[PDB]
Amino acid sequence: SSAKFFVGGNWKCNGSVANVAKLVDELNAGTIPRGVDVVVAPPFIYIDYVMQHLDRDKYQLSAQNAWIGGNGAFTGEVSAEQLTDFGVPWVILGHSERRSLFGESNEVVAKKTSHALAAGLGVIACIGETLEQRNSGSVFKVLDAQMDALVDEVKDWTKVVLAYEPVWAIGTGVVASPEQAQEVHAYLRQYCAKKLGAAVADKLRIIYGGSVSDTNCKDLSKQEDIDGFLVGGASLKGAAFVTICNAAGPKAKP
Amino acid sequence: SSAKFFVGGNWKCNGSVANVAKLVDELNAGTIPRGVDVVVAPPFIYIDYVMQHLDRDKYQLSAQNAWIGGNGAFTGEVSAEQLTDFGVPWVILGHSERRSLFGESNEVVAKKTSHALAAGLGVIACIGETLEQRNSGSVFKVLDAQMDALVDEVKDWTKVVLAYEPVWAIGTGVVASPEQAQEVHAYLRQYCAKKLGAAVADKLRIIYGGSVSDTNCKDLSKQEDIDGFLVGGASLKGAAFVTICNAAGPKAKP
């Protein structure tokens, strides 16, 4: 493919004022290679502080979710229009935790994505199959359906990053190897070549959202079709997250 | 009952940086009577700005929702612990828009409430029946079930405000009269006297969350069992919202 290599840090539902301030200072102390895009995604309430204190040279902001449509009578929700106006450039949509806890369907994720893109955001669009689905021999069926929904809604992939979450290897006692990750990313790449054209597919960042740490990031980053990461808990440890950002090597390059 | 008279402004999913700044300046220009509690509930991303710029003399902050439990792997959610640590004193839970769009059940609302109270927040706990439920002769059945769930979870009502939303009169083409509002609030008061004891029920604020404006606020505020308001769209117009806060009269008094 390529790239730029792309690393997103999903803080999930974690933070305190003191811990966020400390994490921002750790991130600001880190050195990131030229030509890597790095995004960090705090809970909504911290986005103002982070945008004001985190080095813009090195990092961009993301939200962890957005509503399916524009402003209106949707108590508790934040819209893509609000995020764009606030100066946030990215949003994560369709994370496995929202597909499962909040019942976000393939179609809901896809509509959230197209709405966000039309409001001016970039989207980290998440897909992935569970252990039950992998056990049943449904990996292609599930991923194709998740992707077909996105392709039905999205016309321009320039500001989309596709994130694969091996949800079979998240909280199940199963580890995913780099070879298993690459097998899925190669499948996704050929799917996208067929649906979108080889030029779009080659430029699309397909990032890995299984458990990524400072321990395994270089084994993963060397895989042919892994263009970066959507990091979970390691994103809360500044130096470990900066190490993951440095795993890019030749995929930066710049 | 009483009171203090309590007015909450639910901004819902509305705002821009410029509009929020303007609304805060309008709110700061308003005069509020002694002895009225006023809370304003921006979308999450604006809470920092509002907390920093809105007059603390006159207004407290609220969030519009919170997660059901503590911090953890819940992408997109904000916890009650985060809100308390941020300095937010209140949260709205169980709003009709979340019961319907997000399928928050009676039990989910109640557990969100008890969790929020244990994290140190006050809760504006929302209940209310739809037009279908009122058509079917289920008003008591539905309200009793919503309240029974809350009573099962909540031990201390000191930091709870109960908000009744006539969802039958919200987006249906039906208006609720002040007499219809008072009939429900009187029912809720006697229910709470029976379940919680007359002393708790007398001190509990039961606020009205039907369509409240600067036009109808004094007709509503004079009703015996209406202790305040959960305002929707009028909360986005500063002077109109301040007028609603001034509807308290003798229920302030202070």
Side-chain angles (χ1 to χ4, degrees), chain B residues 18-73:
Chain B
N19 288 349
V20 169
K22 180 179 171 261
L23 179 54
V24 166
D25 284 344
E26 290 174 346
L27 292 168
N28 287 340
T31 74
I32 309 291
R34 294 220 327 104
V36 177
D37 283 333
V38 186
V39 176
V40 305
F44 293 123
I45 62 171
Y46 303 111
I47 289 178
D48 188 318
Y49 178 92
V50 178
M51 182 71 77
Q52 298 198 56
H53 293 266
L54 186 64
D55 184 345
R56 294 184 190 257
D57 76 338
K58 293 166 191 183
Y59 307 108
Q60 291 184 292
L61 267 290
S62 185
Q64 288 178 25
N65 185 40
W67 179 231
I68 195 167
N71 288 1

Side-chain angles (χ1 to χ4, degrees), chain A residues 10 12-17 44-46 64 67 71-77 82 85-86 95 97-98 102, chain B residues 10 12-17 44-46 64 67 71-77 79 82 85-86 95 97-98 102:
Chain A
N10 181 9
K12 306 188 183 184
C13 183
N14 290 286
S16 66
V17 170
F44 293 123
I45 62 171
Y46 303 111
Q64 288 178 25
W67 179 231
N71 288 1
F74 315 114
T75 295
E77 295 300 298
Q82 288 166 340
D85 170 85
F86 207 77
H95 192 280
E97 291 154 7
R98 303 205 64 88
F102 290 91
Chain B
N10 181 9
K12 306 188 183 184
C13 183
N14 290 286
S16 66
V17 170
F44 293 123
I45 62 171
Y46 303 111
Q64 288 178 25
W67 179 231
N71 288 1
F74 315 114
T75 295
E77 295 300 298
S79 72
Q82 288 166 340
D85 170 85
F86 207 77
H95 192 280
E97 291 154 7
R98 303 205 64 88
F102 290 91

Side-chain angles (χ1 to χ4, degrees), chain A:
Chain A
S1 44
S2 87
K4 295 157 77 195
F5 204 73
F6 183 101
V7 180
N10 181 9
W11 295 4
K12 306 188 183 184
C13 183
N14 290 286
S16 66
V17 170
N19 288 349
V20 169
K22 180 179 171 261
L23 179 54
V24 166
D25 284 344
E26 290 174 346
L27 292 168
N28 287 340
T31 74
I32 309 291
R34 294 220 327 104
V36 177
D37 283 333
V38 186
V39 176
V40 305
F44 293 123
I45 62 171
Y46 303 111
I47 289 178
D48 188 318
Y49 178 92
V50 178
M51 182 71 77
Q52 298 198 56
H53 293 266
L54 186 64
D55 184 345
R56 294 184 190 257
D57 76 338
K58 293 166 191 183
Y59 307 108
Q60 291 184 292
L61 267 290
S62 185
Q64 288 178 25
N65 185 40
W67 179 231
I68 195 167
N71 288 1
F74 315 114
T75 295
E77 295 300 298
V78 176
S79 72
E81 290 83 343
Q82 288 166 340
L83 294 169
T84 291
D85 170 85
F86 207 77
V88 174
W90 287 98
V91 60
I92 299 167
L93 297 170
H95 192 280
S96 60
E97 291 154 7
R98 303 205 64 88
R99 289 177 178 263
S100 64
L101 297 173
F102 290 91
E104 295 188 358
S105 66
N106 291 341
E107 293 74 25
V108 161
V109 173
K111 288 178 180 304
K112 284 187 170 200
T113 295
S114 58
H115 178 76
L117 293 167
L121 290 171
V123 177
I124 299 158
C126 302
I127 67 170
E129 85 287 15
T130 63
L131 181 59
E132 177 157 343
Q133 286 162 346
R134 178 165 285 235
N135 282 347
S136 77
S138 299
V139 173
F140 297 126
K141 204 196 158 126
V142 168
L143 296 182
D144 285 357
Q146 292 177 333
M147 284 305 298
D148 285 346
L150 287 171
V151 168
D152 194 55
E153 287 285 330
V154 176
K155 41 304 107 190
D156 182 359
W157 287 72
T158 294
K159 300 182 60 162
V160 175
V161 169
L162 182 63
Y164 172 64
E165 299 184 76
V167 178
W168 57 271
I170 300 169
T172 57
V174 181
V175 171
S177 72
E179 297 71 30
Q180 287 166 315
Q182 169 60 23
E183 179 179 39
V184 175
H185 278 242
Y187 180 84
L188 295 170
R189 182 81 59 197
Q190 67 78 44
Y191 170 107
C192 289
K194 289 175 174 165
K195 274 53 184 99
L196 307 174
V200 171
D202 197 58
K203 188 106 192 82
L204 176 66
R205 276 78 74 81
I206 309 178
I207 67 173
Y208 179 70
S211 303
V212 182
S213 70
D214 47 330
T215 308
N216 63 13
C217 55
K218 287 190 150 146
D219 295 328
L220 288 157
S221 65
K222 69 180 185 188
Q223 300 303 317
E224 178 179 348
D225 288 290
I226 299 185
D227 302 313
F229 300 115
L230 186 60
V231 185
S235 68
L236 300 174
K237 300 175 191 218
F241 180 70
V242 171
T243 294
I244 298 166
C245 297
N246 280 263
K251 301 189 173 177
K253 128 58 151 137

Side-chain angles (χ1 to χ4, degrees), chain B residues 144-223:
Chain B
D144 285 357
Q146 292 177 333
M147 284 305 298
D148 285 346
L150 287 171
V151 168
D152 194 55
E153 287 285 330
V154 176
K155 41 304 107 190
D156 182 359
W157 287 72
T158 294
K159 300 182 60 162
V160 175
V161 169
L162 182 63
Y164 172 64
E165 299 184 76
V167 178
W168 57 271
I170 300 169
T172 57
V174 181
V175 171
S177 72
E179 297 71 30
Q180 287 166 315
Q182 169 60 23
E183 179 179 39
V184 175
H185 278 242
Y187 180 84
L188 295 170
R189 182 81 59 197
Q190 67 78 44
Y191 170 107
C192 289
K194 289 175 174 165
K195 274 53 184 99
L196 307 174
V200 171
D202 197 58
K203 188 106 192 82
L204 176 66
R205 276 78 74 81
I206 309 178
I207 67 173
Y208 179 70
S211 303
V212 182
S213 70
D214 47 330
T215 308
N216 63 13
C217 55
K218 287 190 150 146
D219 295 328
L220 288 157
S221 65
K222 69 180 185 188
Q223 300 303 317

